[PDB]
Amino acid sequence: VAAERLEPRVEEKDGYWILKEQFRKGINPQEKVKIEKEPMKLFMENGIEELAKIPIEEIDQSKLTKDDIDVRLKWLGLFHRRKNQYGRFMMRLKLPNGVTTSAQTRYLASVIRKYGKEGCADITTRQNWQIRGVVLPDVPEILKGLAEVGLTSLQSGEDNVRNPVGNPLAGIDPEEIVDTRPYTNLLSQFITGNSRGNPAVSNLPRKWNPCVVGSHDLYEHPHINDLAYMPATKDGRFGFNLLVGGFFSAKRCDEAIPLDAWVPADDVVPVCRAILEAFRDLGFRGNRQKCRMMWLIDELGVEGFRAEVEKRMPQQQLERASPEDLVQKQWERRDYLGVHPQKQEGYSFIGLHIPVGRVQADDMDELARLADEYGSGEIRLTVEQNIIIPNIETSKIEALLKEPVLSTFSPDPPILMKGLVACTGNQFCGQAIIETKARSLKITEEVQRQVSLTKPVRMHWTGCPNTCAQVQVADIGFMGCLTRDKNGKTVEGADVFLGGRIGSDSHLGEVYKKAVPCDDLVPLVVDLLVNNFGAVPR
Ligand code: SRM
Ligand code: SF4
Numbered sequence: 110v111a112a113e114r115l116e117p118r119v120e121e122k123d124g125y126w127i128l129k130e131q132f133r134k135g136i137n138p139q140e141k142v143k144i145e146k147e148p149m150k151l152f153m154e155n156g157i158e159e160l161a162k163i164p165i166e167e168i169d170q171s172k173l174t175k176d177d178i179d180v181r182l183k184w185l186g187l188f189h190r191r192k193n194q195y196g197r198f199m200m201r202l203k204l205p206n207g208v209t210t211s212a213q214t215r216y217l218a219s220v221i222r223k224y225g226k227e228g229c230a231d232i233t234t235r236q237n238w239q240i241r242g243v244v245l246p247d248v249p250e251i252l253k254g255l256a257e258v259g260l261t262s263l264q265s266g267e268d269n270v271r272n273p274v275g276n277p278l279a280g281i282d283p284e285e286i287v288d289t290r291p292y293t294n295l296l297s298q299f300i301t302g303n304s305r306g307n308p309a310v311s312n313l314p315r316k317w318n319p320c321v322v323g324s325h326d327l328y329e330h331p332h333i334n335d336l337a338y339m340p341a342t343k344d345g346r347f348g349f350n351l352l353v354g355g356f357f358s359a360k361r362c363d364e365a366i367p368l369d370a371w372v373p374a375d376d377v378v379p380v381c382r383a384i385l386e387a388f389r390d391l392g393f394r395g396n397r398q399k400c401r402m403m404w405l406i407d408e409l410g411v412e413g414f415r416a417e418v419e420k421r422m423p424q425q426q427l428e429r430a431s432p433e434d435l436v437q438k439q440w441e442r443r444d445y446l447g448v449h450p451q452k453q454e455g456y457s458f459i460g461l462h463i464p465v466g467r468v469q470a471d472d473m474d475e476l477a478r479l480a481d482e483y484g485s486g487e488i489r490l491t492v493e494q495n496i497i498i499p500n501i502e503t504s505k506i507e508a509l510l511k512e513p514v515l516s517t518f519s520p521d522p523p524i525l526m527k528g529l530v531a532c533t534g535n536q537f538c539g540q541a542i543i544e545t546k547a548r549s550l551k552i553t554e555e556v557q558r559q560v561s562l563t564k565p566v567r568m569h570w571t572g573c574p575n576t577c578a579q580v581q582v583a584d585i586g587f588m589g590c591l592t593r594d595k596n597g598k599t600v601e602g603a604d605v606f607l608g609g610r611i612g613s614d615s616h617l618g619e620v621y622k623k624a625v626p627c628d629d630l631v632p633l634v635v636d637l638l639v640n641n642f643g644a645v646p647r
């Protein structure tokens with residue numbers, strides 16, 4: 110790699126970071142959008158106030174404003190559902206470590222309630238909230254309301270650092286390695302500039318996913334993050350070994366690889382900054398399918414990339430990885446659904462199943478009520494799109510288990526439901542090839558009617574090759590496609606994946622059978638479970 114390849118391609122200009130003139134040749138259409146107008150201006154210079162006043166039909170008549178709503182608004186966490194819910198916006202938060210409060214939950218509920226049939230909310234595969242139904246004129250007020258309850262929606266989509274994932278049992282688990290909340294909080298604050306916006310990290314070549322590990326279970330999926338902090342002692346000091354470049358895409362899925370770097374715990378933010386600066390400064394900005402950070406690491410080599418991180422550290426020092434980390438390879442992933450004792454004597458947490466992560470306003474209020482009456486007003490989200498309510502005096506559990514809402518959001522659903530994960534799909538998502546959420550529930554119900562099992566088989570449904578529901582990590586994965594029935598009629602189908610493993614012995618699954626009509630999946634899955642996962646016909 111030439112010395113010329115290492116010239117930073119972006120520069121700071123009037124508080125924002127923009128591509129230098131000599132590096133603008135051959136860039137993708139989105140890079141052109143960012144040059145035409147800095148997206149962060151919609152928030153940091155309050156451009157949203159005037160934009161929100163223009164009728165959507167008028168907005169669509171000019172490239173600048175259409176790009177504002179379809180692209181730049183993702184820097185404010187707003188996602189125009191152009192194809193499938195025209196004129197309405199999904200809104201996505203920053204929610205480090207998946208931690209929410211009852212007050213925040215009620216606020217989100219009140220927003221979606223306004224929108225009636227156009228409104229609902231979802232827990233995401235990054236343990237985050239999305240709300241739906243938002244109309245542009247309401248955005249300024251919603252931004253204020255979020256701030257009032259201690260939430261931000263900043264930099265949650267497009268070419269930004271995504272939600273910092275942590276241990277859902279952080280601070281409450283007798284078996285945790287390190288409480289991940291301080292670190293994920295620091296990361297979120299750094300990324301969003303304490304909810305004011307951070308332009309230093311908002312002009313990346315592509316999305317970028319971070320996680321901090323604190324569990325032997327590896328609930329945080331470090332193997333599929335752009336940056337994963339693996340807890341490790343080095344020379345008697347506590348810190349993190351660093352894995353880099355994990356990602357999924359339609360074209361390519363890759364697990365994270367060692368940077369061969371360890372940082373002390375206090376350097377979590379400095380090294381995040383250094384890595385992001387290296388990616389921002391040096392990443393390819395052509396074909397969007399070749400813009401994820403792993404492509405830069407392949408181009409420079411891991412050592413070449415490492416040197417670029419090193420030069421961006423304070424005092425330009427970056428220690429080599431510690432030979433061992435603190436994560437025990439001998440470990441069975443623990444079920445968190447149901448009632449479990451906390452490390453705080455006399456307290457329990459309860460994991461509740463949220464069917465396919467979907468909730469209505471009334472449901473959110475009920476969950477917020479439970480958290481107040483039984484817990485400490487805290488609700489935690491998980492990457493399987495479930496919830497945990499921590500800090501419940503164990504003496505209250507008997508009463509809790511009799512609560513009517515627990516028949517819907519159960520602490521002990523059937524085993525296949527415990528492991529079921531599904532993306533948005535075509536109810537709202539314009540990229541979706543099939544409907545996912547309703548279908549996956551229906552199929553899973555029918556399958557479980559036919560077989561019993563003891564192995565916690567994990568089934569993931571994703572609506573298109575973007576694989577937001579991570580089918581490559583599943584025991585059985587379903588990727589949306591269109592296919593043909595016996596008569597040659599177009600029907601929704603799934604490509605079926607097998608081989609995904611999570612935890613320390615991770616592995617990426619692959620397509621096993623293409624183009625199965627969704628209507629034919631039940632018998633296929635029943636047989637797979639009996640033949641490969643020890644299931645027994647009922
Ligand atoms: C909501 C969520 C799935 C879910 O039901 O939980 C989701 C939903 C969408 N993803 Fe995703 N992704 C979600 C996690 C994922 C993950 C999983 C993860 O982070 O562990 C991946 C695969 C891992 C990865 O990125 O490396 C993922 C891979 C993508 C991709 C393909 C990325 C690529 O490099 O090609 C796209 C398309 C893109 O960005 O170009 C995408 C784009 C989209 C969009 C924004 C597409 C669009 O605007 O319509 C989806 C919004 C649909 C909607 O209305 O909800 N989504 N997306 C997840 C929100 C996470 C969050 O809170 O931030
Ligand atoms: S996997 Fe495809 S269909 Fe599902 S939310 Fe992601 S982009 Fe939409």
Ligand SMILES: [Cl-]
Nearest residue numbers: 183266267268
């Ligand atoms: Cl996006």
Ligand SMILES: [Cl-]
Nearest residue numbers: 190191192539
């Ligand atoms: Cl769309």
Ligand SMILES: [K+]
Nearest residue numbers: 463466493494
């Ligand atoms: K769920």
